């Protein structure tokens with residue numbers, strides 16, 4: 001589990017969004033595993049605006065924050081799951097790191113802010129859905 005709270009927005013893994021999120025939907029993309037909904041209170045997160053390939057992510061299955069090197073956001077093939085059939089997920093970044101399905105929502109961060117959230121994993125790899133291109137998250 002996990003969300004990014006920036007301004008009047010809540011950013012979650014699309015497969016984990018709640019009723020209030022779909023009812024107060026701002027933007028969603030099934031191919032990115034992302035959903036953004038509106039909130040009543042202002043959030044205290046800052047979105048990174050950068051091209052960093054190194055950072056730190058939270059892994060709930062290990063209660064630990066791991067430093068990682070990660071790839072550039074790309075269209076990557078993702079195996080079938082209880083939430084999606086086998087498909088290509090866009091804006092995805094991979095790192096060598098531990099992850100389990102319950103780790104989705106864990107934040108990846110660099111010196112400039114939040115880069116993205118855990119969205120995929122398996123075999124010693126961890127995938128993050130990038131949020132740095134969503135410039136509108138910094139306004140209105």
Ligand SMILES: NC(=O)[C@H]1CCC(=O)N(Cc2cc(Cl)c3c[nH]nc3c2)C1
Nearest residue numbers: 033078081083099100101119120121122
């Ligand atoms: N973004 C996706 O397609 C997700 C949706 C939710 C979901 O359970 N998965 C499967 C999945 C996710 C993680 Cl993080 C794993 C770690 N080891 N094996 C894993 C398998 C894909």
Ligand SMILES: [Zn+2]
Nearest residue numbers: 050052110112
């Ligand atoms: Zn950065």
